[PDB]
Write a protein that binds this DNA or RNA. Structure first.
Lengths: 496, 53
DNA sequence: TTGACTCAACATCCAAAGCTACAA
DNA sequence: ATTGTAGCTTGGATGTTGAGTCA
C-alpha cells in the first residue's frame, strides 16, 4: 500500500503542532513589526488627504451604505497606489510559507543551507524601499493602512504540514508547481467597516481584490493542484491591538465538515491545545467588534448546514447518519431526523440525518457502576443488545441512573468493603464522604504497618494474557483524619 | 530547559526567517526528546519564551 | 471531476477479580 | 514437598487509512 507506520503518524502530529505554533508566533511578531512607529510615519505620507477622508467617511445617518461605499473606494485607491509604491516583487525562494510535504521536511534536515537573516530593521527598510516578496508587500500594506489609523488586520493562512496525510511517498506534480502554489495568497488584510459592522477582505498584491465575504471567498484555494501546497485550515487574524482570533470560519465554506477533519482541533485535546495557543497570543480584552464577528460566525455556522456527501458526515461535530448511530445509542424521545442526504451514485437513494444533540448515549448497569452510578427504583431499560457467550444486556439512560453514595466509615475509621475485601473506587463519588483515597505503591504496606483501619482500593482492571482480567489495587481508602499519618508512613517506608 | 543559543536561533528564525523553520525544528526536536511532552501539555510557556527578548 | 463503493492491512476501543502443571 | 509460580501460543468488534474501480 502507501501508509506509513504509527510512529510516523504520531511524529507527524507532533511536528504539525510544533510547526503551527511557530507559524502563529511568526504572525504575531510580524504584526508587532507592522505596528512600528518609525515605519508608519513614513508610510503615512503615501496617502493623500482626499484618500484619508475616503477611509474615514462621515457617518451617514439616512443610509450607512453610502459610507461603506466611500470606504471601499479609499481601500481601492490605497491598493492602486501600493502597486506604485512597491515596484519590485521577489519570488519566494523555496515555497515561501506554503505547505511543505513530509518528504521535503525530512530531506531539509539532510542538507544545510545558508540563510540571510531578516531583522526588524531589515523588514522596515525593505517595506520603505518597496522591495520584496508578496508577503512582505501585503505586510507593508497593512502597515500603511494602520499608519492612516484604519483598523486593519493582518491575515495569515498558516500552512503547517498536513498531519492527516499518512502517505510515505508524498511526491507532488512539478507541472506549473510555482504558478499553482502562488495562485492564492498566504497573507492578506481585513479592514473593519464600522458602518455595516463587518470585516472587509483585502488582498492588494496577489488577487488584487476587495470583497465583503458572505458565503464565498475569492481567497480560499480551489482545485486539487492548488490545495497540495495551500490547505486552508488556520486563518489567523492579528489586529492593531495585538489581538489574535481564529478567523477560518470566514474563509472556509465547510468549516464544520471538511476543514475540521484537517485541523488539530478535531478532538477535545487539540481543541484545548489550540485555545491555549490563541489565548497565549491574544493580548487584549474582548471588544464589541468581537461580538459582531462572533454573530457573523454563528450565522455562517447556521447556514453551512448538512454536508452534501456521506464522507463529510463521518465524525461531524453536529450531525450523524442514522446508520452511524452506535448500537449503544438511542434517539431522544420525541426527536426525529433534522435533514436528509441525497446519496451520490444511487437514484433516489436518501439517508436520514440526525442532530447529535438529539442522540442519547446508554450504558448497562455494570457500565454505570463503572461510572459510579446505580439504577433508580423502577427504572425501565431503553434498549437490549447482544454480547458474547449469547447474553441480553439491558441499557439505561443517564436519567434512569442515580449517583452511588457509599456508606461512611465508622468512628474508628473502618471501611465497609466488598466480597473480596477491597473497596471499588472507579469515580471520586465512590470515596466515602469522611474518607480519602491515597494512591501509592506502598500505601498498603504503610496502612498495614500502622495497624490502622483501611481498605485496599481497586481503581481499575488490568487486561492481560491468558484469558483473565486482574484487579489493579493502586492504593488505600482510609478515613480522612488518618491521611497525614498514612502520608508520614508512606514517606518513611524505607524505615519499616 | 533549553540553552541560550538554541532559544536565540529559534526566535531569530521565527521572527524573520520562517522559511528556514523545517530544518531547525528537525534538528531541535531530534536533540530535545522532552520538548514533545512540553508542547503537548504547556504550549503557552513555549509561546511566552519566544515572545521574550 | 464527483463521491460511493470495495479491499486489506493495521489501529483502536472496550470489556471488568484464573487455570494447569510441576518443582520444592 | 500437598504450596508457590512460570506460563498460557488480550482478542473481537469496529474504525481508519490509501488505492483502486465504477458510474
Amino acid at each position: 500500500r502507501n501508509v506509513c507506520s504509527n510512529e510516523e503518524r504520531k511524529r507527524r502530529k507532533y511536528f504539525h503542532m510544533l510547526y503551527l505554533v511557530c507559524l502563529m508566533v511568526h504572525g504575531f511578531i510580524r504584526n508587532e513589526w507592522i505596528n512600528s512607529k518609525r515605519l508608519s510615519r513614513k508610510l503615512s505620507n503615501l496617502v493623500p488627504e482626499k484618500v484619508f477622508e475616503l477611509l474615514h467617511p462621515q457617518k451617514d445617518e439616512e443610509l450607512p451604505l453610502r459610507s461603506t461605499r466611500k470606504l471601499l473606494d479609499g481601500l481601492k485607491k490605497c491598493m492602486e497606489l501600493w502597486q506604485k509604491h512597491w515596484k519590485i516583487t521577489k519570488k519566494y525562494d523555496n515555497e515561501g510559507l506554503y505547505m511543505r510535504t513530509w518528504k521535503e521536511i525530512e530531506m531539509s534536515a539532510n542538507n544545510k543551507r545558508k540563510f540571510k537573516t531578516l531583522k526588524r530593521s531589515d523588514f522596515l527598510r525593505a517595506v520603505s524601499k518597496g522591495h520584496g516578496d508578496p508577503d512582505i508587500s501585503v505586510q507593508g500594506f497593512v502597515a500603511m493602512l494602520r499608519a492612516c489609523n484604519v483598523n486593519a488586520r493582518l491575515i495569515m493562512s498558516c500552512q503547517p504540514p498536513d498531519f492527516t496525510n499518512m502517505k510515505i511517498d508524498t511526491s507532488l506534480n512539478g507541472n506549473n508547481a510555482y504558478k499553482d502554489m502562488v495562485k492564492y495568497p498566504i497573507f492578506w488584510c481585513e479592514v473593519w467597516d464600522k458602518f455595516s459592522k463587518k470585516w472587509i477582505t483585502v488582498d492588494p498584491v496577489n488577487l488584487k481584490t476587495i470583497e465583503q465575504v458572505r458565503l464565498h471567498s475569492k481567497l480560499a484555494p480551489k482545485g486539487v493542484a492548488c490545495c497540495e501546497r495551500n490547505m486552508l485550515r488556520y486563518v489567523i487574524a492579528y489586529d492593531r491591538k495585538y489581538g489574535c482570533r481564529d478567523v477560518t470560519r470566514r474563509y472556509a465554506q465547510w468549516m464544520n465538515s471538511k476543514v475540521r477533519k484537517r485541523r488539530i482541533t478535531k478532538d477535545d485535546f487539540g481543541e484545548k491545545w489550540f485555545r491555549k495557543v490563541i489565548t497565549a497570543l491574544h493580548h487584549r480584552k474582548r471588544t464589541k467588534i468581537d461580538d459582531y464577528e462572533d454573530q457573523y460566525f454563528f450565522r455562517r455556522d447556521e447556514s453551512e448546514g448538512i454536508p452534501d456527501s456521506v464522507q463529510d458526515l463521518k465524525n461531524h461535530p453536529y450531525y450523524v447518519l442514522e446508520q452511524d448511530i452506535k448500537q449503544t445509542q438511542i434517539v431522544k424521545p420525541g426527536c426525529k431526523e433534522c435533514g436528509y442526504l441525497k446519496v451520490h451514485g444511487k437514484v433516489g437513494k436518501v439517508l436520514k440525518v440526525y442532530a447529535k444533540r438529539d442522540i442519547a448515549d446508554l450504558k448497562s448497569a455494570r457500565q454505570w457502576y463503572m461510572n459510579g452510578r446505580i439504577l433508580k427504583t423502577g427504572s425501565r431499560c431503553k434498549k437490549v443488545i447482544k454480547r458474547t457467550v449469547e447474553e441480553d444486556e439491558r441499557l439505561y439512560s443517564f436519567e434512569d441512573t442515580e449517583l452511588y453514595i457509599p456508606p461512611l466509615a465508622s468512628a474508628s475509621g473502618e471501611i465497609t468493603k466488598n466480597t473480596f475485601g477491597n473497596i471499588e473506587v472507579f469515580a471520586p463519588t465512590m470515596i466515602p464522604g469522611n474518607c480519602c483515597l491515597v494512591e501509592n505503591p506502598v500505601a498498603i504496606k504503610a496502612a498495614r504497618f500502622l495497624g490502622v483501619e483501611f481498605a485496599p482500593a481497586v481503581t481499575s482492571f488490568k487486561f492481560e494474557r491468558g484469558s483473565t482480567v486482574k484487579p489493579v489495587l493502586s492504593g488505600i481508602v482510609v478515613a480522612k483524619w488518618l491521611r497525614e499519618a498514612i502520608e508520614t508512613a508512606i514517606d518513611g517506608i524505607e524505615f519499616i | 530547559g533549553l540553552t541560550v543559543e538554541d532559544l536565540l536561533s529559534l526566535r531569530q528564525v521565527v521572527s524573520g526567517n520562517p522559511e528556514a523553520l523545517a530544518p531547525l525544528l528537525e534538528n531541535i526536536s531530534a536533540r530535545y526528546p522532552q520538548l514533545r511532552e512540553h508542547i503537548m501539555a504547556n504550549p503557552e510557556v513555549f509561546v511566552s519564551m519566544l515572545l521574550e527578548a
